[PDB]
Curated annotation (Swiss-Prot):
Transmembrane segments: none annotated. The lineage of its organism: Bacteria, Bacillati, Bacillota, Clostridia, Eubacteriales. This is Endo-1,4-beta-xylanase Z. It comes from the Bacteria. The chain holds residues 30 to 284 of 837 of the full protein. Belongs to the glycosyl hydrolase 10 (cellulase F) family.
Amino acid sequence: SLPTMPPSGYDQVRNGVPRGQVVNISYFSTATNSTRPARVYLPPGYSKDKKYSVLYLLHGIGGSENDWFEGGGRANVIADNLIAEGKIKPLIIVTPNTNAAGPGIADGYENFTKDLLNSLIPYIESNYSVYTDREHRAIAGLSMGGGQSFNIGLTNLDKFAYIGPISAAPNTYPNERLFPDGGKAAREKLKLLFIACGTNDSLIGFGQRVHEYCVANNINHVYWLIQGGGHDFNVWKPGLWNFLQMADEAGLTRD
Ligand SMILES: [Pt+2]
């Protein structure tokens, strides 16, 4: 069953496994009034004749859109291998720069909500062959990125049906702000809420309180703790490996 600890080699390049391509892109953001960078993972065999689902994967504080790839996440390798094992269908993974800083910006990480929704998503949808409905859009991330996944995803259930916060940081909104309707929309529209963290992580308390709220308010979700896990990729990689499969099972890649 899932979630579970991944098998050795899940994150290593395997001989004979088709590799997707990671491309660097830039887009104009009305949120920052500047050109912003991002990376896009195109699955092996990517073709404009078919539509793909999209996962927006967010990095941590001070990080970049490279963190989830050669920065330690190895997201492309993990995805490549899962596709080859028939555990997930191909999908596009977008890694943005989560600090939408700019002129007169109070909080760049908060400003990122507008950047993602009004600039990045529209750019991706007009430049790649993808579905544009909530049932084919997921959001996940680590630390500050996990906090943004909670924040953006739960307050925009009309746009995301799968949410995966890993080791969510303090920027995570209070429970009342994440579920202003007592969890009505979450129970009926959210296909997957995957919360994961290492037990040795100092920030464990944030995902923990969201989990406690979901239990008390009967909100279905998956809470997974990696025993002895720290604030590092030895927790974030297994988190992604599991999220990809669970989101796929939940319908993320449904035709
Ligand atoms: Pt922070």
